[PDB]
Assembly symmetry: D2
Homo-oligomer: 422 residues x 4
Amino acid sequence: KNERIEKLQESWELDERWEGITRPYSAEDVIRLRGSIDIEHTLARRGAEKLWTSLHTEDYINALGALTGNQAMQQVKAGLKAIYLSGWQVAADANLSGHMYPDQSLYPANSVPAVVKRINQTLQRADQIQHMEGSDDTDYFVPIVADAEAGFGGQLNVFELMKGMIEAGASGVHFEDQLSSEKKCGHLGGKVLLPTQTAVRNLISARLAADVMGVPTIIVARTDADAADLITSDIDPVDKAFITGERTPEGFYRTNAGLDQAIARGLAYAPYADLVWCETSEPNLEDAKRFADAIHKEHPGKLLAYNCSPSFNWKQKLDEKAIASFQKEIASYGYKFQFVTLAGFHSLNYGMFELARGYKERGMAAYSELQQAEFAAEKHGYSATRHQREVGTGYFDEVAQVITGGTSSTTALKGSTEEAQF
Amino acid sequence: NERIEKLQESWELDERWEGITRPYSAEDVIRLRGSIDIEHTLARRGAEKLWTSLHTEDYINALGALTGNQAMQQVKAGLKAIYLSGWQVAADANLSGHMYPDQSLYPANSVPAVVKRINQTLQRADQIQHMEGSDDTDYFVPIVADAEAGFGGQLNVFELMKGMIEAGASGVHFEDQLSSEKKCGHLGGKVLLPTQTAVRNLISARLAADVMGVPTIIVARTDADAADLITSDIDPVDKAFITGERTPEGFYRTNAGLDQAIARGLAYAPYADLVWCETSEPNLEDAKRFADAIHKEHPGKLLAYNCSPSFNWKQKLDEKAIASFQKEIASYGYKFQFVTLAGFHSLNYGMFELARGYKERGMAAYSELQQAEFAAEKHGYSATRHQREVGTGYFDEVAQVITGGTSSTTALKGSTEEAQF
Amino acid sequence: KNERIEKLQESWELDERWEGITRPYSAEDVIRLRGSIDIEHTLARRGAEKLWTSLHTEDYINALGALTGNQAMQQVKAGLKAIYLSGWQVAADANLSGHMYPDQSLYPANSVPAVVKRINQTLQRADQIQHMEGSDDTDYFVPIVADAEAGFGGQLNVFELMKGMIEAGASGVHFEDQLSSEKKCGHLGGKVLLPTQTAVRNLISARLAADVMGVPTIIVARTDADAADLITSDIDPVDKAFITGERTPEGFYRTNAGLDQAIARGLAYAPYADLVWCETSEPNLEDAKRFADAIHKEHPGKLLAYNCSPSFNWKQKLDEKAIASFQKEIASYGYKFQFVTLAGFHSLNYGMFELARGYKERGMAAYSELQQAEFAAEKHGYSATRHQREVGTGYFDEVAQVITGGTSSTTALKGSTEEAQF
Amino acid sequence: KNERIEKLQESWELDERWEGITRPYSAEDVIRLRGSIDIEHTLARRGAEKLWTSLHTEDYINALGALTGNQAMQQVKAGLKAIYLSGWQVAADANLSGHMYPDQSLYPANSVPAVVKRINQTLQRADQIQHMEGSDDTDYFVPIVADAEAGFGGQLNVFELMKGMIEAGASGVHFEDQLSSEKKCGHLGGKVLLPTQTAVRNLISARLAADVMGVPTIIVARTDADAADLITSDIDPVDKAFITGERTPEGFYRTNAGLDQAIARGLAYAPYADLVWCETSEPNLEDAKRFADAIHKEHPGKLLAYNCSPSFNWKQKLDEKAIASFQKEIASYGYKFQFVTLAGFHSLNYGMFELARGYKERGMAAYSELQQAEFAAEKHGYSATRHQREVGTGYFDEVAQVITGGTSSTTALKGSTEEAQF
């Protein structure tokens, strides 16, 4: 009890991980909520330590939205150093209700944890295949940054969702300052802000959940206040600077949206978050720098996150040169976690539409074209054209050989069309 | 009497059941049904639609889908059926959340869960189109789903078939492999059931469809073309293929090939709506020999063909043969043709290429995909407008109906989608 | 076409089912949201119809909370005419997170539909076992009335949850006028009311879901306003009579709680629900009568529901004569749906504690006492002592027999210890 | 990598945990299958260690079947030292297909691990409540012994199910020598044996999964050979003594069932299992002695498990005196793990039938009778009377107060009927 608490307090005081982070609660409070034993969360712990290190040693970390394990595995094979788990993509195509939803927190709260677990389990299998074949060359255990939306209710829903993300092996979790019952994609209308004090309580709840689980999980504070021109309540005096006095039929207060409202929220959330994220209506370098300088005046060195959103028309907003240089340029402002939220959705839907249309028009000629493009990608590191090997048929054959002392008559890769034709 | 007679009339009077053996009575089926009939709308409409299409179209060709979005794009592309691969579910979409090879390792309710997801995505697509003021596209295309070797015995088959129907499947395939040693048709190590056991599984499948009251399509698959092992020598009709050699596990070695496959194909034909012979390559003359063998006994019998990504197509066939393949086997009676792993290869190839591009060139790579999407809108692609695609418009209308048009928090007005697209 | 619209509009205006019910939307609105086909929901339709007839047949329907199919199956065998599906019980022991939770909407939103479906599936198996053996006497297809709490967010979460309840085969669903993010058990402190207008919109959302599904599901409007002394907002002029002007640190408004507040909400909800339910702090005939009289002054004949809560200390509140007559009496005021919310939780916990303690002290003598109690109950309609039969071993023996033309070697009941010893 | 191999061969050579246990594979093979990292499984490891220690320090460990976390929690509160997780109970009322099934391996293979996980999470919450209130008196983390049936297919299905059990935090797992596609309850007809070699390969597969996961999980080897008079294959020479030559229409071989066939299987499985279990058709002391004496001839001090089955009519088979001493008496033969498989089913079904029938006849008088019985049980350590506390309402109140720095106006136990009336 003494030792357990003293060790926790010692970690908060000495570890540079917690520099500039406020905890408005004690080590004794955390140990009181932990129960009588510590449960180890190996992937969550390893991932969060690796992510913390990468954010401070890489020029920046660029990720793509992944909604299956296989998408994540190809992202790691292409050389990306983190996976982004979009709640938008989970609403669309990968939630535990099995419905297609817009991005309005309509799906079950345990849906993103479930996909974190799936992704970690695919990466484990990929690691096992590689390890079994004699190398540890590729590091398949890359950090997953997951979308917790507005936490699917109040501060206790936030607490439970943060714990579920850690249980599943997420390295980082983002929370946004929206009223959960009205939650929207950052690039839709009808965004309703929480009071500053409530959004702060959600970030404190996420940190308390991480502390109870015993894992230094990365917390990303997102503000929707650049575009949001509604707030649930006028209760917080710091929000009254932006309130016009008009009320909607629902009782929401209208506000003066813009960079001033977002900077105010960023500065409020910075002491309670590892990274700050400002949603924007277009990919604008000047706005990104303005936001960055505002945070950096009060919290120099504060890590920032940037949504390179497919909700933008990139060629409409930016010239070819500006597009090519965009990520390197914003990284120089402190945007060290950068992610294309819906890359997985667009990859999956475009790929299948074009394939199925080709197939409809030209039958097996369209499918052979795809198989040939796959053979052509092998020299750049693609391996999935050998699908039996990719999903672990070789790993399970070796399991069977260890079980039977190498006598099994029913191993799968020997006598396969893969070994004959590939 | 009323329920018995009604069922009996269907079996005897309907064209649907021409050439189909049921070894049990209508009275057997109503004894197992319970006191009420539960309707299965998507299962019934899909099975009716599939049966009609298989008789009106030259052929029906499908691709594997492992998500509702993949299925939705297949429909928008103009395909008339969806294939639900168990291989794909093993690989990336099963209820254990693990990546597995194709050896019946995932939980048995996994394929039904994906059937239900695809039907719910199609339902949403239909809801969006209907709200916007058209019923142009028929989103309710039939799903043909993989039941593997039934994940156990005759009772596991019965339960799985019911699960497929509950989820809204139009058709279901079962193969003549030992469930505990199940393999992908193009993997080694395959073990056949005795003919009599494989026939009992098909009986079990039909009895499940009959209990649920739905005319579900049943595809009987044989793995006897390459499978050189059988569990048992119990069945006298299997004797001709059994060598007498046994494996250490006690499986009996058989002489595999087209003769063993034709024998099972003829045994299964009275108990299924389509017969499917797994092959080791896309060989027109073998396809023709199998078809002629079946049709010799059962003229007009519908057949199914796996246009498998487990074949190296360029290596096996010239451009001309690849171009004509589906229309050529359709002329032998292969009216249901499917690329089992199309969803896997589309998803994996697509993401690898985007991710490598992104790794090398950041947003130039993403912008290239976005520009390709915009161009693809000129031949019917819509997913560029991602907010509309997923039903943001549908939920805006629901909100406006609930609030009588007073809602201050609708999504599409003020979106970047409306301003930039 | 335009007929399919006119028919729906006619049924609302003319069918007895919809007497006294307001729909602020049109038939054309519902058909616009239904898509191109109608999907059949047999158990949800039949059970809603049977629940409506039952409410006009019996003096009252008294139900117990069930958290498993087997509990619901025994409730039917004991002669009860509906099943109550408690969200409290799902929180505690039967939700899709697998956690034990207090009753604060912490669990995933699809959890109660999952349990509705489980209970319907057990009841289907019971009916199959009876049907196969040649009886159709017991009606196993009793209506389920399910807890949708405060809808797990906004009006769209309400819409989706109500659709989930109908897909699962619920006959009725209840919704309460609480802020979802602060949801509590009716007998906990810290309850926050919605504005009257928001609570009404939630009821409108639930009816629109049931109309879109094409099922006449029973909707129960619950008010928490008897004890709730907080409201989210003063936006609704009809709530201003109860609002003191004091505010909490979170920005909630203090209200004067009591029967007057509860009556105001009951009158406001009555046109938008089939039954009205007033949560109470104790089982008091006079208060039950005042509430029913107040409703019936404006809505003569309105069906009411009453929670016979295990959260009450019954012996502390009522003498034994008053306990024995309670349901008979409040039924005469119009409380035609009565339920013990946590019956299942208390039955399962108490029975296992008693069995485990006896077993700890006396080994198999304690287990043999239960088994002898079960044999003694068979005279009264209990059958589960023959566990193999109860769970449908005889049904599956008959499936195997039909499949094999009566040649199976591996049927279960012949050669069982059940066949030899029971 | 040398260190990972070294720590494994050091454990196998030095630790008496592995006395008498044969592993046909190498520490090298285990590390080649594990992958590049070690994942910690705290509850599986602590549970298996606790279970191993209990089986050596106590005369016996007696358990009851539990199918919910609440049942398991009351078993612990009553003073039981292990929890039995019955596959039969999961088939009946707690599997992931949500159907009521006989005990024939019809449900999804991940169902029992899902219930292991639920029970551990319930025990964790009870630990958290006790810890917060300021003691660690009760050890809630009692070991769970879980039913893996016949492994839901071949040796790879066994391998996956064992890993699933360990991931969920099971302390022990049982596997039976039945053909999975024909699996029956031990007390049903139509059981079919695997050949000895195949049964042994399943046990090898289980041990390899535990070694790969890095946890010393208890493996129980069950034989159905006392009553099973069918086998799938005559392939194994050690089985020819029992095979008659008679076959069934399905191709199964008739065998001479009885204690000789069971002793043969028990001796064959002993080197591959930590406990051996012989299914019996009645609770017969002489048969239990004869089995123990035949195993101990070759494996002195081998731990044995005994099913105190509700499939037996206990009063038909034994006198009052014999029932009362039965567990003590078979414990002296080496039956150190004793469990009543279906205690959860009979407790749940009997209790709810009795309550619903009393509720049917006497309304709230019947419910008040249960509530007063519950109050009477408090002196013995029953706490569920106070249901709000039991499920962690006070835990989540203290979480809310920590997040809000003590400023929350919405905590749940303050103003509850539980604080007012109990």
